[PDB]
Swiss-Prot record, chain C:
Pfam families, alphabetized: Oxidored_q2
The protein, known as: NADH-quinone oxidoreductase subunit K
Lineage, top ranks: Bacteria, Pseudomonadati, Pseudomonadota, Gammaproteobacteria, Enterobacterales
A GO term for molecular function: quinone binding
GO terms under cellular component: NADH dehydrogenase complex; plasma membrane
């Protein structure tokens, strides 16, 4: 292949090494389940329950 | 007698070196996991023990107590023999490394030649694992990996011949005594880079790694393959420090400390290269091994010879 | 401490073993293997002779011998691949058309 | 009109999610493994907004005959602002780290190429058809759900 | 309580042998290598759990294997289509002991919403399952929770130490159901956040 | 001597401990736990590796004694490496060293 292509490709590889090393120097984005509890929005569709009215009787 | 205690002390030094190298290979399989986590904006295994230190023992126990399995219509001796080669070849190649003044296993007259012998024997692990599995896909993958390995082993020796040409001997202690003023990373920079690529490629590391030839392996044989891979990484990094970075030489710290930091530096760079680089295609890899690196090593040796004969 | 006669006899043993393997085998691959055995035995004999006299010439002849062995193994395996492509069998007795 | 804008925003959020998955999966298929980790972090930002709005991540089932299941929750705009400030730097980093790498270009350029005639005769739509030069997008040719207002 | 396979029995468990069996179980539970197997959307959430924002590698369970021989855990994450069921059975048979199964999602659990002509109604029709995850899809942290449940199940089981010495039976602990374990705290919930806010 | 035989003993112990460790590792793996047509390009690449490996051995022997061979040795190694690169160029230009056509 062309020597210019080889030099440009070597530069791109060096750039990739540099960005991944800088990403190593960055801050972690990991949410530490189960030590860190998962934040769920209020309308999250998880476990189904049956509720009660304010008088204490079951609403169903 | 002083001779007997000197012999036993040297034997104890060799056994200590061997145990530390095997432990370094396994513990830096775990360290590769942790460093991949660190490079990938995550943590890696940090739960099994204090900081994940017992995760490796868990892996070792899991592979020890797995059901041993060999394919039925397959060869048994060749299948069992391939992981032994993949472990033993580079583990034995470590034996020439000078770690510090007074700590060497074999101060051979050949040295570097013994490393070349071990790599040449090391290709048989891939070939044997591919043939013995009685799988067409694994056989084809192993032939591909072996062709790549030969494509880079063909210039590994010359990439080191630059350093031997400067030092005038095959011995390792004389090579590190030839670095008392200038390390070979500066004059043998082409030799430095070509030995880096060759050492990565003969170890089947990223980015140098028809299905794979390890699919039929399981249990403790898979563990042999992987631990032999990381042991080879330790050996290649130590060879790199010995040849191009002065070995034990340093201004302030004790020599073993300097050797340890440089070896750890190059193993960290090994894992960083795994994390960062993308994997090229097959034909591009063989063409970069043959067309670029082999004439580069030949020209590097020629220019090195002309330079050293100039003075 | 090592006799020269013992090294020469070891080389002769390996040479005649390679010759026997060359003759008795119908498969061309084992014929090539026996040829490699014989040439390695000859190179070993040259190493023994050079080491007895304390000369480099034995190892130099060893280098020339293994260069020849590499070239001959390359050519022979190319010919064996050609035979397996054309005739789909490695029986050397079937390659016998010219006679008289 | 508010139904149209809500459905358009949800569809564009999920389109960004799918495209991030596709680009990261392509980069992983080439041989680079770290952009899939970062693209899944961006997918987690999108999933934070989608979880806030619909209460689910992957299969919201939130559109309805005649509208959507609920009104937008209070504070959705802050999460949308956070995602819109987070995304472009990450996308530029993805391009510079993987998409401009010459190894990826050698693996990708010229591979499995077809023109406009082959795309038309096989019913190819989407990015392949537009990559053949044919300017046919449903959101412009046959507009729906208030896409003409954007 | 325990279940025997080669029957409901008691705990069979010397003081060195018990400690070393505990070390075997600890090594097995802290080194779980899942099998790479993409069926449907549940696999997308499973590989989401593998990524950096969740980092299931912290538990030592990130080593994804393309070969069933090197995989200890099979995560059936997706619908069991009738054409894919012999493939799943063959992949499960190709695995080696000890092998564990996690059903991920309603499709793998029971067939889910696809009670249809071309779908097998749950992977436990033909493959034993140790941990079930409800959800469609379960979120990645639910997969991590099922992983922890699998570790608790593994750490309480008794397996043959060697194939030449000792009892070769496999003992699986009949653990308490998670529903009855969490019924104390789940029923006591009174007020939740209103869905109007964020 | 004393140091050379100490190093011989250390090297032999290194050999046997490494081999025994690998064999014991596989023995313990077998013990523990309970039970239940290729193209000619491969030949060409391996053949090229063999030929250039022998030529590399010649350069190995050259490189050790540069300052004992003078400029004549450099000249002879220069014709050697010129024929080396001529063969390499010959292989590259005809398609021998290309995996794909
Ligand atoms: C889906 O993406 C992938 C992963 O998830 C992040 C992986 O973990 C992996 C597995 C690879 C790694 C965890 C890094 C290499 C290190 C490994 C496997 C550690 C093994 C260690 C031993 C056997 C020593 C005992 C692959 C291949 C992958 O493609
Ligand atoms: C020093 C500390 C660390 C030491 C550890 C070891 C380091 C080395 C690790 C291994 C490096 C492997 C390099 C693999 C090279 C593969 C070459 C290749 O595939 O080239 C083909 C590619 C595209 O070619 P093209 O013809 O365009 O494609 C066909 C078109 N459809 O063409 C190209 O991409 C052209 C450029 C090819 C590569 C040039 C050399 C790259 C060297 C690796 C990067 C080093 C980065 C810096 C490292 C730290 C330095 C301090
Ligand atoms: C599966 C098993 C396969 C076989 C494994 C090995 C079997 C034998 C095991 C026991 C070996 C015991 C050690 C032998 C002696 C070691 C010391 C020695 O060789 O000393 C001689 C020489 C010294 O020279 P030097 O010190 O440089 O100069 C001063 C001279 N007094 O130094 C030398 O000559 C050094 C050069 C020779 C070193 C050879 C080391 C072993 C090489 C074979 C490795 C095989 C790898 C596995 C198979 C690969 C795939 C087939
Ligand atoms: C990856 C590196 C593996 C190295 C294995 C060998 C370790 C040998 C340790 C020797 C320690 C003592 C060295 C001589 C004394 C100089 C240093 C004194 C302070 C430690
Ligand atoms: S359970 Fe739901 S999310 Fe999982 S595979 Fe089935 S349809 Fe997809």
């Amino acid at each position: 292949m062309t020597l210019k292509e080889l030099l440009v490709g070597f530069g791109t590889q060096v750039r990739s090494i540099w960005m991944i090393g800088l990403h190593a120097f960055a801050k972690r984005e990991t949410r530490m389940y189960p030590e860190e509890p998962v934040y769920l929005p209020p309308r999250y569709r998880g476990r189904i329950v049956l509720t009660r009215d304010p008088d204490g009787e079951e609403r169903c | 007698s002083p001779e007997l205690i000197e012999i036993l002390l040297t034997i104890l030094k060799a056994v200590v070196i061997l145990l530390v190298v095997v432990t370094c290979g396994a513990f830096m399989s775990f360290g590769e996991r942790r460093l991949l986590g660190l490079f990938q904006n995550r943590y890696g295994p940090n739960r099994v023990g204090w900081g994940g230190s017992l995760q490796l023992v868990a892996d070792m126990i899991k592979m020890f107590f797995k059901e041993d399995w060999i394919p039925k219509f397959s060869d048994r001796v060749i299948f069992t023999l391939a992981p032994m080669i993949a472990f033993t070849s580079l583990l034995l190649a470590f034996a020439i490394v000078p770690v510090s003044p007074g700590w060497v296993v074999a101060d051979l007259n050949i040295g570097i030649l013994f490393f070349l012998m071990m790599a040449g024997l090391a290709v048989y692990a891939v070939l044997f694992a591919g043939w013995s599995s009685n799988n067409k896909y694994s056989l084809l993958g192993a032939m591909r990996a072996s062709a790549q390995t030969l494509s880079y082993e063909v210039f590994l020796g010359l990439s080191l011949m630059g350093v031997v040409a400067q030092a005038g001997s095959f011995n390792m202690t004389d090579i590190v005594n030839s670095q008392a003023h200038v390390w070979n990373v500066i004059p043998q920079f082409f030799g430095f880079i070509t030995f880096a690529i060759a050492g990565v490629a003969v170890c089947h590391r990223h980015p140098f790694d028809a299905d794979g030839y390890h699919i039929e392996y399981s249990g403790m044989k898979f563990g042999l393959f992987f631990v032999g891979e990381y042991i080879g990484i330790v050996t290649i990094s130590a060879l790199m420090v010995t040849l191009f970075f002065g070995g034990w030489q340093g201004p302030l710290l004790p020599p073993f400390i300097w050797f340890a930091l440089k070896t750890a530096f190059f193993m960290m760079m090994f894992i960083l290269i795994r994390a960062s680089l993308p994997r090229p295609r097959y034909d591009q890899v063989m063409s970069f091994g043959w067309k670029i690196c082999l004439p580069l090593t030949l020209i590097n040796l020629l220019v090195t010879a002309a330079v050293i004969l100039w003075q | 401490m090592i006799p020269l006669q013992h090294g020469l006899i070891l080389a002769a043993i390996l040479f005649v073993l390679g010759l026997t393997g060359l003759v008795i085998r119908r498969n061309l691959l084992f014929m090539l293997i026996g040829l490699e055995i014989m040439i390695n035995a000859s190179a070993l004999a040259f190493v023994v002779a050079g080491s007895y006299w304390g000369q480099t010439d034995g190892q130099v002849m060893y280098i020339l011998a293994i260069s020849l062995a590499a070239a001959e193994a390359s050519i022979g395996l190319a010919l064996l691949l050609q035979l397996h492509r054309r005739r789909q069998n490695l029986n050397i007795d079937s390659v016998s058309e010219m006679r008289g | 009109d508010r139904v149209n804008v809500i459905r358009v925003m949800l569809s564009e959020l999920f389109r960004i999610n799918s495209h991030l998955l596709y680009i990261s999966t392509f980069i992983q298929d080439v041989g680079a493994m770290t952009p899939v980790f970062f693209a899944f972090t961006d997918r987690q930002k999108i999933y934070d907004l989608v979880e806030a709005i619909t209460g689910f991540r992957m299969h919201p089932a939130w559109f309805r005959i005649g509208g959507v299941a609920h009104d937008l929750p209070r504070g959705w705009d802050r999460l949308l602002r956070e995602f819109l400030d987070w995304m472009p730097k990450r996308l530029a980093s993805y391009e510079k780290a993987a998409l401009q790498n010459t190894i990826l270009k050698g693996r990708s350029q010229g591979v499995a190429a077809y023109g406009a005639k082959e795309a038309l005769e096989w019913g190819t739509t989407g990015a392949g058809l537009r990559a053949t030069g044919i300017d046919f997008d449903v959101r412009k040719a046959r507009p729906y759900s208030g896409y003409e207002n954007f | 309580d325990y279940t025997l396979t080669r029957e409901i029995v008691t705990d069979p468990l010397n003081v060195f042998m018990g400690k070393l069996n505990d070390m075997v179980n600890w090594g097995r539970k802290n080194s779980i290598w899942p099998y790479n197997f993409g069926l449907s959307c549940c696999y997308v959430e499973m590989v989401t759990s593998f990524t950096a924002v969740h980092d299931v590698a912290r538990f030592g369970a990130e080593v994804l294997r393309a070969s069933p021989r090197q995989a200890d855990l099979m995560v059936v994450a997706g619908t069991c289509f009738t054409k894919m069921a012999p493939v799943i059975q063959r992949l499960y048979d190709q695995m080696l002991e000890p092998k564990w199964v996690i059903s991920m999602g309603a499709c793998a659990n029971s067939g889910g919403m696809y009670d249809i002509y071309s779908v097998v109604q749950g992977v436990d029709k033909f493959i034993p399952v140790d941990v079930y995850i409800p959800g469609c899809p379960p979120r990645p942290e639910a997969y991590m929770q099922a992983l922890m449940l699998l570790q608790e199940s593994i750490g309480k089981e008794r397996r043959p130490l060697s194939w030449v010495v000792g009892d070769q039976g496999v003992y699986r602990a009949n653990m308490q159901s998670e529903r009855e374990r969490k019924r104390g705290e789940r029923i006591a919930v009174t007020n939740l956040r209103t869905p109007d806010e964020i | 001597s004393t140091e050379v035989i100490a190093h011989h003993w250390a090297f032999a112990i290194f050999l046997i401990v490494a081999i025994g460790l690998c064999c014991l590792m596989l023995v313990g793996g077998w013990f523990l736990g309970g039970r239940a047509r290729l193209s000619a390009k491969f030949y060409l690449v391996a053949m090229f590796f063999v030929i250039f490996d022998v030529e590399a051995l010649y350069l190995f022997a050259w490189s050790t004694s540069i300052r004992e061979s003078g400029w004549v040795g450099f000249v002879e190694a220069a014709i050697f490496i010129f024929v080396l690169l001529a063969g390499l160029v010959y292989l590259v230009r005809i398609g021998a060293l290309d995996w794909t056509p």
